[PDB]
Symmetry: D3
Subunit: 257 residues, 6 copies
């Protein structure tokens, strides 16, 4: 068991643990406590012996527009203490939940993802797209922040170093063509952008077919070995990213933007 | 000198040590002792001061359909002792022979490669294809096994992480288009699939031309430096892969499949 | 301040430190002291708190034809002492200046680059091309040398391992199509090959536009994290490359070629 | 520059940034917000161009008895992310990355997270041979914290570290000496940490005469690169792997 | 659960999985299939949810004199892959990856591959000051085995390791002590390994009282990550690089 | 084979390549071209198939007082690249990569870059307990050189290394002993380095009897892999980061 969250649901269907972002009217923008809740759902999936795949699905036109700004609120003895509790803690936890996850993590990209949400997409093992209008945007340079959610490692790993610099330094999107040219997207479903619900069902239908006849413990044993290629780099980056962001928050520049 | 093997021949032509898989009627399926023999041939090439390139060629419609199942046979005090001797020993040795090889390793891909044979293809420095119908298949999830022959490292390195997951988790081939898009194949010769013999000769003809005027010790000096990028990762993966496979063999699941 | 160099100029325009190779009649071939001067200019840019981007531009039909052979000259107690002073010292210094540079390094590729110059291009963060006729050539195998300027790491990182072997082992160029397929070039300006001057101005015009509204310290903070992915590998390669080249120089083979 | 804290003071004397734990009646036990305050002070020292050495000094009979166990959330996970994870990752990182020479004046025992911070210092001086470090994780139902995963095997050896951590035994003075953890024992009475503290500073003043202090920092910058990756990896993994121990509830019970 | 082996017994007592080498008349020399059996026992202990400590004990005057030299193939390479490579990579990996706390009760000397396994244990207790470890690779015409490439410099220092390995000299008790390799010397007569073994278990029982044993395993899991990559790399390279020494024939001659 | 050098001789005796520093009147201080010559001699030894051990011996009261400060460029940077960077990266690399067993006969103190080379040797023997190593970088306005960034913490411990380097203090005999840096102290009078040198060679001759010498090299090849990456990284970074200290001018002033 776990508390209910009106913005994120989950369910289990056979070997699939399915997480669903269900706040399309706000483009599935997520507050700090929602990122924590995502980590807690990954923990549930990770401990469930019948689960082999964790599938993240969303709703409406965006996968997620990223961290919900409105959050702010109004209690802490310093600006540092405040940002350690609100930003550092949450980022280090949810990023670690993705990095360490032992089940096969699949993202169903129904639209654009931005910011920390787009970082989490880049931490997934497999990504499927609704159509060719999807993109990922990491607007750190425009917001006065730095890399988050393991993007320091994942973006050069999955898109190449030179491409990563052009996108990050100048606040440009990783568009569909860049995703395709780097094999980031394993299948494009070519469905209308209004059709996230049908897209999500179609991915699960194909997954049910694809797992027939496989020995699912092999999937997990192979993931365990594959994860060892970059696990150290991801764990180092996570700690450094969250601690180096603090000067940007405490300076105040992101609040201005 | 070395014993003769009716399934694998070798010869030396100038700076080229040429290994030839010559059992096309059985799709060049290899038994454990044949993988060991391949390692022994690599050792011969590696110690020969006149050799600068080790070229692996095959015959018929397949490069190699992988490990020969028929092997089985019928002596060991436990299932563990049996699999240590038959699987662990052989895999750790032939994989190491490829990883450490100091001469430029070139694979002439005359058709599909499967399993451990396809792992060895991914350990080569340069790969040439007969035509666009070649593929590599790593059927570990269908066989109830895990990554072998350094594929834990080589597949993400040469095909990208997300692509590797889609292929390995779901037992899908790395097809020609994926090989091309990742620069895995350096030249496609576009010859008919029946023509492995002519393909093999044509590769060697072009190689004779390409080495004219080069200082061949530079080739080896550059390889020695390039190998240092991933040598530690490959050596770590080899040990872990062979030892982690044992539970899959001892459990018995692969024997069923 | 710094001494003047008739072959290389520099200037500062806002957040841009601009280095210009200005010897088109000799294809911007560089002598040892010119590589050192490039390192000294990078040091100036690196220490200047108003500089966020270091832009390297050239002139005429070549970006740079590489190390200037004529150099030779005619004083050293041994061949080793001579090559330590003339080759090892200079390479280890200029390569380190590129590896450690904290500002965003952008290369404006107005034509082909060869040898050590082409290595430096591969160390830049972002590369823009004048048109599709550019290429990089690393002629080490024809010259009787080995990898230089961090190419041991940069070429497999940015072009893939198998491609790198085909190019380096056989003295073949990394052509435009290979650069494009690996995302090495962030934008091709598609201008006539005679038009380096207009190309250079156009890149700076677009850069002025692209930085509007960005928090430039974020660019540097992100680079600092991204650089940590491969900094150890580059520093190890630099030391090994320069010291392993000595036997090739002292043997005498490169002097013959 | 920074808020006041009744339990921790600081001052600058020439090239020395001196942090002083000043709550000897409670054995200098620290709450979560005090560890955060320590990180903030390290940031001040790190950014101060006149500072070359950061010296951490305490008071009374203990250096620090560790986290103060006396010292709104939608779940237990959310609570422990905010109270344990956040604070540990931040103060540990502040020590790991610190660019000034970090010197600990060990006036008595240190326990737990405080003792982890002592093991992150570059140089340690002891008041006398009664000092020890205790990492009581096995008795509390916790795991390694504050980079001890890396620092203890590095500075005390692997086999020694297992005997001490697995069985909740102290790293005593003799073990510290035999591994060169303590650079000097001042052999002074435990009833006067104030004199000890002053004597260390007096000897530091003498030792820096004639040195080019930027060389000290340049050397530290290179030396730190030997294990910086390992420490950063350990920090993320330690804080996240502890959560199951807190959320289980076992530490609350102990 | 597993076949019987006349030379090696095992039993479980509470949280302790106890492996006992019981062939004192042959100094507990082990054949290839016995090293494989040891790996199989470690796998049993590793998978047993009630086990927290794996204790390796022996008998008589030696812990183990190493590989038993008293103890069908198309080539010499094929033979040595099956007899040496396979067995060494498997038993070494079993030790490297083991998740339970591994304790060695050193009742006398250990030699060769057996002494490599002692250096892979987390904690080592000695019967008395007459124990030593000998790695006679240079005299046998072999190279490092059982992860000694990593473990010996890690636990004894690099310079010491070179003096011992290059010149076929023992790591004696004083060297073990000075490096903290031995956590406790029991100072008991060599004529009674049985009493030593019982005394170690008695003290372990006392030491675990009041501890949360899952913390022991959680801490080991983190500590192991410091050198796990190095050990796995060394294991593959050691076994494969030995082949030229066996296939040359030089060890057969010595 | 190689030019003569009045300050450094060499000879081969069986499996031993013996390098002898022979300028005791100037405490065997070495100029830049002499460090280059040392690298060239190591290359000779490394390529000689009959050589298994490279032994470095000196003369008089000092092993070496370090770089000789008594001992055309368009800039200060160009000058220091040619005179300091080039020479340091080359001789340090020669030591790091050397495939033969490197033994240092420490007849007296070593300072600076010479003392860095001593810390790169595989085995060190001392004439008596008066030897020390001094790395006076903080007093000279320089930083670590010759791989000391890695070797000193590795062989003496991190905390000890900081006390010595930050405060320009010697690594004395007792510190060398306690860390096992010295494999044997010969306890001979300082007035006869020649006898010391001969005695070391006599004992080496005895110790190699019955050994398969290719095993020594095979073992070194594996042992070297533990830290080779760290040493190569440190070498590039040390030489390049020193430049600002030389170009500033601070060392010239000291």
């Amino acid at each position: 068991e776990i508390r209910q969250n009106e913005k994120i649901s989950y369910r289990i269907e056979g070997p699939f643990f399915i997480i669903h972002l269900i706040n399309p009217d706000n483009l599935n923008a997520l507050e700090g406590e929602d990122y924590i809740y995502l980590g807690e759902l990954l923990e549930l999936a990770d401990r469930n012996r019948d689960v082999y795949f964790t599938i993240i699905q969303s709703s409406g036109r965006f996968f997620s527009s990223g961290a919900d700004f409105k959050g702010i609120a109004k209690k802490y003895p310093s600006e540092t203490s405040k940002w350690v509790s609100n930003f550092v803690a949450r980022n280090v936890y949810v990023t670690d939940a993705f990095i360490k996850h032992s089940k096969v993590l699949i993202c169903c990209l129904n639209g654009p993802a931005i910011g920390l949400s787009a970082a989490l997409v880049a931490l997934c093992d497999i990504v499927y797209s609704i159509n060719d209008k999807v993109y990922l945007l990491y607007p750190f340079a425009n917001l006065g922040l730095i890399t988050e959610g393991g993007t320091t490692v994942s973006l050069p790993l999955k898109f190449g170093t030179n491409t990563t610099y052009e996108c990050l330094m100048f606040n440009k999107p990783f568009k569909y063509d860049i995703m395709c040219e780097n094999g980031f997207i394993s299948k494009n479903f070519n469905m209308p952008s209004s059709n996230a619900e049908a897209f999500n069902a179609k991915v699960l239908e194909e997954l049910r077919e694809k797992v027939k006849g496989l020995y699912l413990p092999s999937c997990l044993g192979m993931k365990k070995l594959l994860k060892s290629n970059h696990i150290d780099a991801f764990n180092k980056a996570n700690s450094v990213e969250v601690n180096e962001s603090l000067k940007y928050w405490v300076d105040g520049e992101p609040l201005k933007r």
